[PDB]
């Protein structure tokens, strides 16, 4: 149960970090919408920079460093 809550939280999280990306600019020397940095195709757990963008304010700081240095 606990996990079936998370997997939905990231797929929700990518879409907003994509659908709210592809509507930033569509540039002629830009990128295709949601390409792959790899050749291979399957689901590979994303890097922190994927979920949180350059947003980089606080709730990030409480995510990556959240567990370490304290309750």
């Amino acid at each position: 149960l606990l996990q079936a809550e998370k997997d939905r939280r990231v797929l929700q999280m990518l879409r907003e970090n994509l659908e709210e990306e592809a509507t930033v600019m569509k540039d002629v020397p830009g990128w295709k919408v949601g390409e792959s940095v790899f050749h291979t195709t399957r689901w590979v757990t994303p890097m922190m920079g994927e979920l949180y963008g350059l947003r980089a304010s606080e709730e990030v700081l409480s995510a990556t460093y959240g567990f370490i240095w304290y309750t």
Partner: protein, 168 residues
Amino acid sequence: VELPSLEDLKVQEVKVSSSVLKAAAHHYGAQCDKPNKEFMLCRWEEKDPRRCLEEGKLVNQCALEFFRQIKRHCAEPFTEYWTCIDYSGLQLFRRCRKQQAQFDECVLDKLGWVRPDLGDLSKVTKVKTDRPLPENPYHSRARPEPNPEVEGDLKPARHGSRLFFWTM
């Protein structure tokens, strides 16, 4: 990449604290097991938790009616039970031991449940095969081809070591 839309989202998450969520949590899974073990096999057996969202709404669903069940019959002993365990640090289970019966007085009795002491979450189980058991494993491109072998019937050296002169 293909990601599903924003939809089949915003579903009903069970919204409760982390103290109550461990209050029952125990009668919970031992008696259900209808989607959930099966829902594991839609992950471990085939990865990429994108292709498999469906039972996610089944396993999330089982909880909904569970906490919706318990609210009808007895929430009074439960509400008082997860208060003590919520009195805090570490959320021990050995402080509330006294009140453990008061919550479980008629639950195992009235609506007919059982205390699944040590047999829960062990005894690695089975489910069933409904979905196609996937071939075409995760990435799995191509072979490629190996080296033909050499055995034959041998010989001694042909004329003897053929170095510079050095007959034998």
